[PDB]
């Protein structure tokens, strides 16, 4: 800050500390799971 | 006198004896808080909870003047959440049908 060196990055509280774990990253595409499961089972039988 | 009011009604407890268990006492370089309880903050949160004060509806709490802390406006007494709502209220509620917003827009 004043006439002193800026701290190293890890010396600060987490930038995303207030954003819940589910959000980083978003897991989206839940719609496709079932589809790809049935798909893989049918495949197996083939 | 006008100061006759401000006499001590009872005898104050003497300070007879040593520091209480696990008091802050300070050696060479020691960062010391008289304020923070030594034993109960050092306790892990997963066990005790994030709670500072008993978990109860906040209408029973008032933010104190001049002290940073809260107090009960009925001193020391507590009513559990179950006594705020009607008997057997789902997610204690005025009524079980909807939440706040739901009640309001249904009403609308």
């Amino acid at each position: 800050r004043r006439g002193k060196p800026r701290p190293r990055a890890g010396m600060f509280p987490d930038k995303y500390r207030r954003v819940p774990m589910l959000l980083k990253p978003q897991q989206g595409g839940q719609q496709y799971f079932n589809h790809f499961l049935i798909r893989s089972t049918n495949d197996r039988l083939t | 006198y006008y100061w006759s009011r401000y006499r001590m009604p009872t005898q104050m407890p003497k300070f007879d004896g040593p520091a209480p268990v696990a008091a802050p006492q300070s050696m060479n370089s020691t960062k010391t808080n008289e304020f923070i309880d030594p034993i109960d903050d050092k306790f892990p949160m997963s066990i005790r909870g994030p709670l500072v004060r008993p978990d109860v509806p906040e209408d029973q709490y008032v933010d104190s003047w001049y002290i940073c802390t809260s107090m009960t406006h009925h001193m020391g007494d507590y009513r559990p959440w179950s006594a705020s709502a009607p008997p057997n209220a789902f997610r204690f509620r005025p009524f079980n049908e909807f939440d706040a917003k739901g009640r309001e827009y249904v009403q609308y």
Binding site: - | S4, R5, R7, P9, T10
Partner: protein, 49 residues
């Protein structure tokens, strides 16, 4: 114990029950509440004469 709050209220709420105290004090005893003239190191600065 110590005092949380203080209020001026008439003495007939709590006063030593009639059978504990000496008989009629108004008639048989002349009592003045007064202050000690000396310095008192401890105790009450008002005594009953």
């Amino acid at each position: 114990q110590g005092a949380v709050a203080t209020a001026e209220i008439p003495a007939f709420f709590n006063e030593r029950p009639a059978w504990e105290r000496p008989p009629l004090e108004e008639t048989l005893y002349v009592t003045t509440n007064k202050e000690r003239y000396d310095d008192v190191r401890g105790g009450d600065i008002y005594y009953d004469d």
